[PDB]
Ligand binder design. Structure first.
Ligand SMILES: [Fe+3]
Ligand SMILES: [Fe+3]
Lengths: 114, 118
């Protein structure tokens, strides 16, 4: 059994053509998990995960702040205490328009989970 | 399967009592359930003050994230308390349980492969 403070997992900064101002923690990876993985994303003020899609779903829980969710068209803001279910293949992305860090949990099946 | 995205306040789901021979003082909200999940389900558990999920095991894993309060985790040997911001991975077949020794509600997300139900 693994019991750990998520913050203590070292985050990985991401800065690419599609993702900026984001870091990622792998909490439960496929080293441990047989079916699905658990990650925690932190999005700095102005950070962006641009629209994309996958062959797999996302299950998300918003832990902190106000998260802007990019949809195929348009966008919707949600806050801490929301969950999000992204069907396979659905276009999605994220932005933080606020002045503080936004955090959300993201779980994906193992095929996405490397 | 279907397209789209569901975005919902978790508290818009009513917390239902869990009532079994091994659980007392616990409620659950099904967030992403069997009707929708391709692979795994997401529930939000609320442990009332003094609530208890006795030690048990099952042939599927748990992935847990603690949202609120101080959660006592029962292990095969002994126990450990964690708090908001901790995650827990429980291997298939590993003995585990939970207790709330505090005065206030403890909440945690619990995800399992959908073969284990909701
Ligand atoms: Fe994605
Ligand atoms: Fe269990």
């Amino acid at each position: 059994m693994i019991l750990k403070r998520a913050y203590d997992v070292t985050p990985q900064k991401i800065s690419t053509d599609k993702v900026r101002g984001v870091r990622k923690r792998v909490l439960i990876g496929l080293k441990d998990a047989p079916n699905f993985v658990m990650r925690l994303f932190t999005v700095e003020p102005g950070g962006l995960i641009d629209r994309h899609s996958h062959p797999w779903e996302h299950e998300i829980f918003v832990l902190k702040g106000k998260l802007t969710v990019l949809k195929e068209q348009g966008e919707e803001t949600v806050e801490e205490g929301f969950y999000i279910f992204v069907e396979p293949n659905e276009i999605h992305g994220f932005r933080n328009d606020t002045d503080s860090e936004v955090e959300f949990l993201v779980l994906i099946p193992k095929e996405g989970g490397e």
